[PDB]
């Protein structure tokens, strides 16, 4: 659980910042596709609860 606590918050800290998402930086939104593509959201919700 501590290892997966490290694999998660690394990629959270590689998420492109919000002001670059307001601009149409296609490279920056390509990455934000990939990290969202990897992880299902509802997996977190059972973990968060």
């Amino acid at each position: 659980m501590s290892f997966y606590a490290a694999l998660i918050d690394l990629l959270g800290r590689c998420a492109p910042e919000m002001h670059l998402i307001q601009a149409g930086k296609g490279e920056a939104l390509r990455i934000r596709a990939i990290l969202r593509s990897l992880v299902p959201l509802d997996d977190l919700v059972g973990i968060i609860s």
Partner: protein, 46 residues
């Protein structure tokens, strides 16, 4: 236990002063997906 002695390093490699860098973040993840064994194998999956 052993693999967690690198990610605590690399989470200082892209996140500084409460902000993310760009040029390192756009090249760590391009390289982290060349060897998908580097992720934990329960999500590589359960």
């Amino acid at each position: 236990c052993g693999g967690e002695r690198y990610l605590d390093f690399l989470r200082f490699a892209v996140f500084v002063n409460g902000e993310s860098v760009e040029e390192n973040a756009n090249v760590v993840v391009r390289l982290l997906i060349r060897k998908p064994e580097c992720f934990g194998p329960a999500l590589r999956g359960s």
